[PDB]
Amino acid sequence: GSADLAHGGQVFSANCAACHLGGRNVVNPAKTLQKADLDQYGMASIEAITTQVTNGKGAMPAFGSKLSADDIADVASYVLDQSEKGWQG
Amino acid sequence: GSADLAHGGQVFSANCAACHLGGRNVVNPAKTLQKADLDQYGMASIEAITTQVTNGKGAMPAFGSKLSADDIADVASYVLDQSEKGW
Ligand code: HEC
Numbered sequence: 362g363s364a365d366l367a368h369g370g371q372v373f374s375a376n377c378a379a380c381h382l383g384g385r386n387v388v389n390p391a392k393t394l395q396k397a398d399l400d401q402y403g404m405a406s407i408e409a410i411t412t413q414v415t416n417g418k419g420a421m422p423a424f425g426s427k428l429s430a431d432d433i434a435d436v437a438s439y440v441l442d443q444s445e446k447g448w449q450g
Numbered sequence: 451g452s453a454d455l456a457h458g459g460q461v462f463s464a465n466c467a468a469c470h471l472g473g474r475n476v477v478n479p480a481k482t483l484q485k486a487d488l489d490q491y492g493m494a495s496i497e498a499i500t501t502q503v504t505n506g507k508g509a510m511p512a513f514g515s516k517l518s519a520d521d522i523a524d525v526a527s528y529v530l531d532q533s534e535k536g537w
């Protein structure tokens with residue numbers, strides 16, 4: 362596909378899969394990356410995901426000082442794309 | 451003392467149990483709060499626990515901007531005390 366989504370998947374594996382492998386949320390099981398959960402909590406957008414990745418929230422760490430702006434844009438795109446695809450395989 | 455440990459337990463329930471319930475570690479089972487693990491990684495002290503809680507590490511979030519210094523001292527004392535008596 363696109364370069365952005367591919368790089369987003371690498372940012373995801375290295376920074377997010379520890380808690381969200383395959384769209385899970387092993388820490389807070391009510392707040393997964395499945396589309397229904399993103400929709401329930403108003404997180405089904407690039408800007409909302411970007412805000413939470415940048416600032417952290419609750420038990421989720423912040424990445425705003427550790428990732429580049431492009432890294433965060435790409436990982437947000439990857440999450441939204443995988444969520445729309447049902448985190449298939 | 452007893453006051454510190456009691457408040458530490460409340461800070462722990464509100465901020466740490468999501469990942470460390472009963473002294474475990476839902477994200478990385480190799481790095482629990484059990485005495486053997488704290489000893490292995492040099493984390494079996496108020497100073498070490500305070501630092502990690504304040505700064506975060508890896509997938510563990512930082513709490514230094516969200517908790518008072520007293521909150522962090524107390525939760526550190528709680529964790530050390532639980533580890534010594536076995537969670
Ligand atoms: C474990 C330490 C995590 C890391 C690593 C990542 N996330 Fe996370 N995420 C975690 C928690 C505990 C929560 C809920 C926070 C709360 O209190 O509300 C979240 C939530 C999200 C969400 C929203 C999910 C939803 O509302 O259903 C998103 C979109 C999200 N997380 C993305 C994300 C990214 C992109 C990560 C790597 C940069 C990442 N998380 C890491 C726990 C953890």
Ligand code: HEC
Nearest residue numbers: 420465466469477481482487488491493499507508509510
């Ligand atoms: C999930 C989002 C966590 C939250 C909430 C808390 N901790 Fe944590 N802890 C977590 C991880 C992923 C790790 C290992 C980090 C690494 O990469 O090395 C830890 C580690 C600790 C340790 C050291 C344990 C050991 O070395 O065996 C301690 C003492 C510790 N965590 C304490 C602690 C406190 C007091 C918390 C609430 C304020 C807390 N953690 C929350 C994951 C998560």
